[PDB]
Amino acid sequence: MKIAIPKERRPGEDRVAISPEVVKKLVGLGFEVIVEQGAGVGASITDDALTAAGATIASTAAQALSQADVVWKVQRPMTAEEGTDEVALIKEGAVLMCHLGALTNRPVVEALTKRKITAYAMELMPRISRAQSMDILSSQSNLAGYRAVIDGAYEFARAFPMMMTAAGTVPPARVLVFGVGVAGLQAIATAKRLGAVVMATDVRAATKEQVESLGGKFITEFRKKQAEAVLKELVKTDIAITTALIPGKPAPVLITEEMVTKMKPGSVIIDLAVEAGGNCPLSEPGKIVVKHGVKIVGHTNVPSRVAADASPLFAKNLLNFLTPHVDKDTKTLVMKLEDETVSGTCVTRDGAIVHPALT
Amino acid sequence: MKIAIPKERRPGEDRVAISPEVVKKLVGLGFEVIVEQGAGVGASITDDALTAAGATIASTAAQALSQADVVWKVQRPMTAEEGTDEVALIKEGAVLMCHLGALTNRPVVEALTKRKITAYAMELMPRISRAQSMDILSSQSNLAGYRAVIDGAYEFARAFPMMMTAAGTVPPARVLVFGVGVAGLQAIATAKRLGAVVMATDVRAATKEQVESLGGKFITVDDEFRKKQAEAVLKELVKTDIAITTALIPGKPAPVLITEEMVTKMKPGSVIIDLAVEAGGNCPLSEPGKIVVKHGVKIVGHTNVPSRVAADASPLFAKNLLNFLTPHVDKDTKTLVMKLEDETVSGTCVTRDGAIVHPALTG
Amino acid sequence: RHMAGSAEDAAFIMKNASKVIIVPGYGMAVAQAQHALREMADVLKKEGVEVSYAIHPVAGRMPGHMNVLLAEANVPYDEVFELEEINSSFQTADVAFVIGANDVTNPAAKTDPSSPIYGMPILDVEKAGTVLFIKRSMASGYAGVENELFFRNNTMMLFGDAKKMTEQIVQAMN
Numbered sequence: 001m002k003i004a005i006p007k008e009r010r011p012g013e014d015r016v017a018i019s020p021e022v023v024k025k026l027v028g029l030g031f032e033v034i035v036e037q038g039a040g041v042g043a044s045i046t047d048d049a050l051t052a053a054g055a056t057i058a059s060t061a062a063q064a065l066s067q068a069d070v071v072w073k074v075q076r077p078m079t080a081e082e083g084t085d086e087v088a089l090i091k092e093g094a095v096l097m098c099h100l101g102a103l104t105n106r107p108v109v110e111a112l113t114k115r116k117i118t119a120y121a122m123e124l125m126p127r128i129s130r131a132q133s134m135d136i137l138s139s140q141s142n143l144a145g146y147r148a149v150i151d152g153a154y155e156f157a158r159a160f161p162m163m164m165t166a167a168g169t170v171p172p173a174r175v176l177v178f179g180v181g182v183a184g185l186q187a188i189a190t191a192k193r194l195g196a197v198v199m200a201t202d203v204r205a206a207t208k209e210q211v212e213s214l215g216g217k218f219i220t221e222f223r224k225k226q227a228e229a230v231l232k233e234l235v236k237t238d239i240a241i242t243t244a245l246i247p248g249k250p251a252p253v254l255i256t257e258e259m260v261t262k263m264k265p266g267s268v269i270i271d272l273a274v275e276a277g278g279n280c281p282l283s284e285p286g287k288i289v290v291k292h293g294v295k296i297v298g299h300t301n302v303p304s305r306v307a308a309d310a311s312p313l314f315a316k317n318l319l320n321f322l323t324p325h326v327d328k329d330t331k332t333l334v335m336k337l338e339d340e341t342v343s344g345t346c347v348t349r350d351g352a353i354v355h356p357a358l359t
Numbered sequence: 360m361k362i363a364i365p366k367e368r369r370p371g372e373d374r375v376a377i378s379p380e381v382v383k384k385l386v387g388l389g390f391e392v393i394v395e396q397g398a399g400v401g402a403s404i405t406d407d408a409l410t411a412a413g414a415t416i417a418s419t420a421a422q423a424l425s426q427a428d429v430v431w432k433v434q435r436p437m438t439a440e441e442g443t444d445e446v447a448l449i450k451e452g453a454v455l456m457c458h459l460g461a462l463t464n465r466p467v468v469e470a471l472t473k474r475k476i477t478a479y480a481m482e483l484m485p486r487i488s489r490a491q492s493m494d495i496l497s498s499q500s501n502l503a504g505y506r507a508v509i510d511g512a513y514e515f516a517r518a519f520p521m522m523m524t525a526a527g528t529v530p531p532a533r534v535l536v537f538g539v540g541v542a543g544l545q546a547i548a549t550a551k552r553l554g555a556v557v558m559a560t561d562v563r564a565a566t567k568e569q570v571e572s573l574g575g576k577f578i579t580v581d582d583e584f585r586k587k588q589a590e591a592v593l594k595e596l597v598k599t600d601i602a603i604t605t606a607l608i609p610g611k612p613a614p615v616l617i618t619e620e621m622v623t624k625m626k627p628g629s630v631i632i633d634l635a636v637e638a639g640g641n642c643p644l645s646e647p648g649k650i651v652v653k654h655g656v657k658i659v660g661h662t663n664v665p666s667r668v669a670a671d672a673s674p675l676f677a678k679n680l681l682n683f684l685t686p687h688v689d690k691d692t693k694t695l696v697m698k699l700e701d702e703t704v705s706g707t708c709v710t711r712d713g714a715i716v717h718p719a720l721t722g
Numbered sequence: 723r724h725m726a727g728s729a730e731d732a733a734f735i736m737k738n739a740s741k742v743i744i745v746p747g748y749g750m751a752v753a754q755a756q757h758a759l760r761e762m763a764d765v766l767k768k769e770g771v772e773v774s775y776a777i778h779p780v781a782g783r784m785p786g787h788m789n790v791l792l793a794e795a796n797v798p799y800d801e802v803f804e805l806e807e808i809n810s811s812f813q814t815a816d817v818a819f820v821i822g823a824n825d826v827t828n829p830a831a832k833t834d835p836s837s838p839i840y841g842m843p844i845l846d847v848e849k850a851g852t853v854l855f856i857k858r859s860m861a862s863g864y865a866g867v868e869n870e871l872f873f874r875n876n877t878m879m880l881f882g883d884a885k886k887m888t889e890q891i892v893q894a895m896n
């Protein structure tokens with residue numbers, strides 16, 4: 001019974017799909033852990049670390065895989081049309097667990113299907129309660145929220161907190177968070193714990209209470225004035241963190257160029273939705289853009305910027321979604337087809353595409 | 360009374376030695392302020408931010424210094440050696456207030472003297488309870504202790520706070536800050552703000568009761584003894600995620616707190632932040648102006664940390680100068696006269712009206 | 723139906739306990755009682771009372787929600803434990819101070835597979851000598867499921883605002 005974790009080859013990815021703890025948990029369940037040397041060095045996890053937990057070490061994505069019964073990865077594998085073929089490295093008919101961006105990447109879904117493999121699109125985890133244990137979307141987008149501030153703070157001259165000094169008083173920084181989600185909330189929190197005067201805004205006014213519960217302060221034809229009340233706040237804002245993301249669609253515009261011009265110079269904007277368009281048309285994926293005196297930071301794969309902490313999490317998100325099925329003693333897997341998660345996850349099993357949305 | 364602040368020309372200086380709030384006060388004292396185009400454009404201080412306070416804008420430094428009696432700057436002027444000779448812009452026999460870096464830069468002291476330029480080396484304000492509102496060192500090495508933590512977290516691959524999550528519990532970073540000075544104290548503050556677990560150590564034990572008061576813990580003994588102590592420090596540096604060093608000594612080299620020996624004994628991904636880097640750093644691998652990776656650890660040693668907080672530091676550098684020059688300003692004859700009996704004008708002045716009035720290496 | 727008490731009753735119950743396990747939930751966050759809470763925690767600790775906070779992975783409305791506030795209230799990371807380290811204790815603690823929390827305590831999610839939280843782990847609070855709930859009404863939480871614990875022979879309710887109540891208990895103890 002082999003479970004194998006390769007190494008992230010997608011550009012910019014530094015997270016691994018495993019942890020020393022997770023190893024023992026798998027090892028205990030009658031599994032053989034295999035990971036290609038230095039597959040987690042980018043996540044501060046070394047070969048030694050694994051091998052002590054009980055993991056054996058491979059030398060190639062290939063020599064790691066061969067007869068891999070179930071595979072663990074953070075980012076969907078690479079088709080050959082991308083210059084490297086990892087799918088074709090997965091023993092035909094194995095179990096693939098990772099975030100496949102499923103709904104968007106048909107090309108890759110079929111490559112797996114052709115190798116007759118069961119792919120479990122983790123980014124489709126059922127929005128239930130038992131499932132929160134195995135949600136990769138919120139465990140990663142959480143740290144992202146933290147990072148947004150750490151990165152926003154870094155690119156900011158002025159200090160965040162209000163400091164008492166013989167030279168007078170240093171006022172605090174005014175942060176403004178768009179979209180109050182797992183990501184957003186963490187932003188608000190850390191931002192405030194840092195000393196900023198945090199203030200959020202979301203279209204779901206059901207959040208005003210969550211924001212307020214974090215010491216935050218919510219902002220309040222309807223948008224004729226709402227989208228305006230924001231102006232009054234944005235004009236006195238130092239950090240503008242945007243995290244609005246509505247899937248399969250380009251992120252909605254929260255900060256238009258027209259607005260960045262009306263802002264105070266020296267200010268910075270973190271556009272975590274940079275990849276899906278960006279809540280700000282000026283944000284360019286990858287680097288920092290400067291215009292109208294404003295720095296518009298739009299990094300990529302933000303969780304990777306927390307790659308060390310985000311990894312042991314992304315591992316559990318898996319280990320969890322998995323163990324219910326490692327049958328009691330028979331020592332095999334058993335994906336309960338009716339089990340809410342599985343029948344929400346799996347996009348294609350031993351043969352062809354099974355998920356509804358794809359048909 | 361013509362006061363003039365020019366734009367900093369040394370590379371990597373974004374700070375300006377003026378604020379609009381101050382220009383507003385200086386005119387008050389009966390001065391005429393002059394700044395050169397976007398001198399603090401790097402401190403987010405706009406020119407029309409100053410024209411509004413009352414200061415006049417000059418197209419060039421050379422012009423914004425020509426007829427100035429007192430001259431406010433952040434860093435020591437450029438000699439004709441170095442490249443462009445700034446000294447020659449200050450009116451022969453005039454006042455210069457700035458961080459001269461005098462105790463280790465005669466070339467600037469000499470080249471100034473010859474102009475009958477009286478220069479006060481602000482980094483030499485005496486450590487007296489009443490001088491605090493005029494000490495640039497503190498009102499900077501403070502923002503520095505802050506930034507230390509920020510650049511420390513930015514290069515760190517984990518998250519600082521403890522978070523109990525559905526995917527498991529993410530543990531806190533564990534900072535270790537050697538040197539509980541102005542910066543070390545803020546390093547601790549900022550560190551706990553982010554939810555980290557702070558460890559600190561210092562020679563001057565008057566520190567301890569301060570570390571504990573912000574929330575951290577002092578690395579202590581269990582009860583020659585010199586190393587029974589230094590040993591424990593390692594017992595904690597193996598657990599540490601970020602090491603902030605700020606240990607200095609007035610005069611010359613920065614002490615060594617982290618020997619490459621110990622770096623080798625640290626956790627992979629650890630990050631060290633050497634603030635004393637421009638004095639050799641409390642850690643030898645701290646190459647200045649660059650992160651350096653060795654033994655799987657980031658040795659972050661940026662230069663001129665205060666500039667990294669331009670917008671905030673500047674206003675404080677300009678409020679320090681003000682708190683030092685305000686006394687020596689007669690109110691009604693709107694004229695200035697630097698005291699002499701004032702311990703302040705004493706231990707700060709490095710040269711006046713042609714001679715080196717300071718007892719440093721010329722007394 | 724359910725037993726209900728007053729800030730005077732909690733004071734006694736806790737000023738006389740040995741071990742106590744504070745269970746913080748979204749409620750405390752919404753009320754911002756991290757300080758009344760820690761304040762109290764001290765009084766207890768001054769009486770030789772044992773205190774430790776139990777944090778349910780999803781207590782709150784964001785990962786680590788109880789954490790920031792507990793830190794912000796200056797609460798010792800060595801008094802804060804997570805579900806898998808704490809549960810083994812309740813059965814050895816005289817009191818289970820549950821302030822602003824519900825779903826994270828519901829035993830339904832270990833029983834009837836129909837319930838919207840079934841499958842989710844919970845903090846075995848119903849093992850502590852006596853259990854106290856400090857919410858406002860008898861309403862439920864996010865899962866909107868009724869909590870079977872409110873009606874047990876070791877469960878007293880302490881109706882009020884997470885903060886306003888803890889303040890009155892600290893007050894009463896002093």
Ligand SMILES: NC(=O)C1=CN([C@@H]2O[C@H](COP(=O)(O)OP(=O)(O)OC[C@H]3O[C@@H](n4cnc5c(N)ncnc54)[C@H](OP(=O)(O)O)[C@@H]3O)[C@@H](O)[C@H]2O)C=CC1
Binds near residue numbers: 748885
């Ligand atoms: N933290 C996370 O990661 C997220 C968790 N969730 C889900 O949310 C739930 C979390 O549960 P738990 O944290 O226990 O929260 P609950 O949802 O059980 O709610 C707790 C209680 O707080 C009370 N309350 C609210 N305000 C006040 C106040 N000012 N004073 C006193 N009481 C107050 C409520 O009742 P009353 O009106 O009676 O006072 C309420 O019953 C779970 O179902 C979980 O899965 C959802 C999103 C994110």
Ligand SMILES: NC(=O)c1ccc[n+]([C@@H]2O[C@H](COP(=O)([O-])OP(=O)(O)OC[C@H]3O[C@@H](n4cnc5c(N)ncnc54)[C@H](O)[C@@H]3O)[C@@H](O)[C@H]2O)c1
Binds near residue numbers: 184202243244247
């Ligand atoms: N089980 C349920 O009752 C149930 C059902 C559906 C959704 N949910 C909620 O779905 C949420 C989604 O996650 P997230 O915030 O980490 O992910 P996301 O990618 O959905 O985050 C985007 C967010 O910013 C906000 N936002 C701002 N402008 C927006 C816009 N134009 N369109 C859509 N959203 C906009 C939203 O509030 C939204 O959460 C969770 O926090 C969860 O509580 C719960």
Ligand SMILES: NC(=O)c1ccc[n+]([C@@H]2O[C@H](COP(=O)([O-])OP(=O)(O)OC[C@H]3O[C@@H](n4cnc5c(N)ncnc54)[C@H](O)[C@@H]3O)[C@@H](O)[C@H]2O)c1
Binds near residue numbers: 486488491608
């Ligand atoms: N002008 C004033 O009145 C004024 C302003 C600010 C601070 N202070 C005082 O000055 C002191 C702090 O320093 P600073 O920032 O001004 O000067 P600094 O930069 O010299 O301070 C940093 C610290 O390094 C420590 N250190 C040096 N070598 C060490 C070693 N080998 N091991 C361990 N620790 C070592 C010192 O104990 C020192 O406090 C405090 O006692 C403070 O109250 C006075």
Ligand SMILES: OC[C@H]1O[C@@](CO)(O[C@H]2O[C@H](CO)[C@@H](O)[C@H](O)[C@H]2O)[C@@H](O)[C@@H]1O
Binds near residue numbers: 155373
């Ligand atoms: O202050 C931001 C932060 O970024 C760095 C990166 O080198 O500085 C860049 O951004 C500044 C604007 O905030 C510019 O003034 C500077 O010239 C540019 O290099 C750091 O120095 C700084 O901490």
Ligand SMILES: OC[C@H]1O[C@@](CO)(O[C@H]2O[C@H](CO)[C@@H](O)[C@H](O)[C@H]2O)[C@@H](O)[C@@H]1O
Binds near residue numbers: 014305513514515517
């Ligand atoms: O976690 C480190 C942190 O630093 C950044 C700064 O851009 O990345 C640098 O350091 C990484 C090592 O941890 C390198 O892999 C990366 O190439 C380098 O730019 C952040 O991306 C990262 O979060």
Ligand code: NA
Binds near residue numbers: 309518519520529
């Ligand atoms: Na951590």
